[PDB]
Design brief:
monomer; Dipeptide-binding Protein, domain 3; 11-stranded mixed sheet; 14 helices; globular; binds histidine; binds nickel (II) ion; transport protein; Extracytoplasmic; Nickel import; Metal transport
Length: 465
């Protein structure tokens, strides 16, 4: 009727907002701040804020906002939500170095111990979305947010059912119900769309784009965005030496991957960050060189008779990753590396066992809110939430720590580029492509978001005509 069916990759376990960005994506939860369609930070739940000095953030919340259970969004509710998320999630904790929070009425004051200029930016992170900590339901199954669609039922790792919250603060939402089901295989997501089992899908495989564009019942939307595919190394395994990481870096053919695997919907990568960001100084592009890789591997004693063995993990959710793994395996054999590819259904859970993998295909949104700090703190610091391979170098740590208290924006750019230059020498990961996000829908579905941060999808204006 006005019911919308969505098919997404990357199944979740908990759907607490501090465990996954899914509740923000599907319209259930909202953070204090957001980014707009051009990627700039804006107030969302906040009416006004001020920073009287470099350790104090004063916020006044909007006065007309309710949670989906009818409770008012007050400063006390925001305090308890943020404190709970800090306690329950390392990602949230390491992004928000908050020393205290005080609340009265609609006003809250957030303090830090020292200057952290990216604090407001990180309050736009979907993992910091606000939920009602006093709700008498399990936040891991049916959290209660302020968004336009309330989660009514969750079948773990399979299906989320949401219903219109009529008193949504920005206006009455335009759909009656949304059903989200997980499907990891992109070809299956496309088949579900073509058969009308689903109405909106994300992460469309590039080789299906033409088939969908050809269909007059469907439409495809693409956004270049800020997501990077990569080969991530497990630094806790002593065999993954600098020579080995450099060898693998030279077996990748980034230009060929962008042209033939992504069919032009990606550009070859050097650093984590898309080269379209104008202040980023990218390292030199590595061109494939099998002879160089063989020479590097000989440094550690590997030969055709005694090759390096690598267990490489992959997953289906981002559909080009496993196509890249196959061609890495074929080419690596020419350089005396035998790669065994293991495709897994739950990538984040699988990689927690650091004895079970040598390298993994991976993807990540490296600059979702306009600053490089988030990525460096989460991917290049020990215990950072996306640093699955435990990369850490004290010299890089020092620069990241300096960046965190640096207010002057041009100085932040300079330190960021120094971190890129120093870290690149270690080959912490091999960044492969800056690739577009491709979303497809039935033509009757209108006003979903396909914007550069790669997080938002559903809002109170999304509809079916
Ligand atoms: N960060 C990886 C793996 C992941 C699973 N769920 C969320 N992320 C990706 O987005 O492709
Ligand atoms: N799937 C999102 C969010 C995430 C957090 N951790 C892993 N993934 C991304 O890769 O950017
Ligand atoms: Ni992810």
């Amino acid at each position: 009727g006005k019911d919308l069916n969505i098919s997404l990759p990357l199944k979740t376990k908990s759907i607490a907002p501090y465990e996954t960005d899914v509740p923000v994506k599907i319209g259930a939860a909202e953070s204090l701040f957001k980014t707009n369609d051009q990627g700039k930070i804006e107030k969302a739940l906040v009416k006004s804020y001020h920073q009287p000095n470099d350790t104090t953030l004063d916020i006044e919340l909007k006065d007309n906002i309710k949670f989906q259970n009818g409770q008012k969004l007050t400063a006390e509710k925001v305090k308890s939500s943020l404190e709970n998320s800090m306690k329950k999630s390392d990602l949230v904790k390491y992004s928000l170095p908050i020393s205290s929070i005080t609340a009265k009425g609609q006003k809250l004051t957030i303090k830090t111990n020292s200057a952290y200029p990216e604090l407001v930016s990180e309050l736009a992170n979907p993992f910091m979305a606000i939920y009602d900590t006093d709700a008498k339901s399990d936040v891991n199954q049916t959290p209660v947010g302020t968004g336009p669609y309330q989660i009514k039922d969750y079948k773990q790792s399979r299906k989320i059912s949401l219903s219109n919250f009529k008193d949504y603060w920005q206006g009455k939402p335009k759909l009656d119900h949304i059903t989200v089901t997980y499907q990891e295989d992109g070809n299956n997501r496309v088949r579900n769309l073509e058969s009308q089992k689903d109405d909106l899908i994300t992460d469309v495989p590039v080789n299906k784009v033409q088939d969908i564009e050809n269909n007059q019942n469907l439409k495809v939307s693409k956004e270049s965005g800020f997501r990077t595919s990569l080969l991530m190394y497990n630094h806790t395994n002593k065999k993954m030496t600098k020579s080995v990481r450099e060898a693998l870096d030279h077996i990748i053919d980034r230009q060929g991957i962008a042209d033939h695997i992504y069919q032009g919907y990606a550009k070859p990568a050097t650093s984590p960050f898309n080269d379209k960001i104008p202040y980023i100084k990218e390292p030199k592009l590595t061109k494939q060189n099998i002879e160089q890789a063989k020479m590097l591997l000989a440094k550690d004693g590997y030969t055709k008779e005694h090759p390096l063995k690598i267990k490489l993990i992959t997953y289906d959710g981002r559909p080009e990753l496993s196509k890249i793994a196959q061609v890495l395996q074929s080419d690596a054999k020419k350089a005396n590396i035998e790669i065994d590819i293991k495709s897994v259904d739950d990538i984040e859970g699988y990689l927690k066992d650091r004895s079970a993998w040598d390298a993994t295909m991976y993807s990540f949104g490296t600059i979702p809110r306009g600053d490089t700090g988030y990525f460096f703190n989460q991917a290049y610091k020990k215990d950072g939430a996306i640093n699955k391979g435990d990369y850490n170098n004290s010299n890089v740590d020092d620069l990241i720590n300096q960046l965190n208290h640096t207010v002057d924006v041009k100085e932040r750019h300079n330190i960021s580029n120094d971190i890129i230059k120093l870290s690149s020498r270690d080959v912490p990961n091999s960044y492969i492509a800056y690739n577009d996000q491709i979303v497809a829908a039935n033509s009757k579905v209108k006003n979903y978001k396909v914007t550069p941060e790669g997080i938002y999808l559903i809002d109170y204006r999304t509809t079916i005509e």
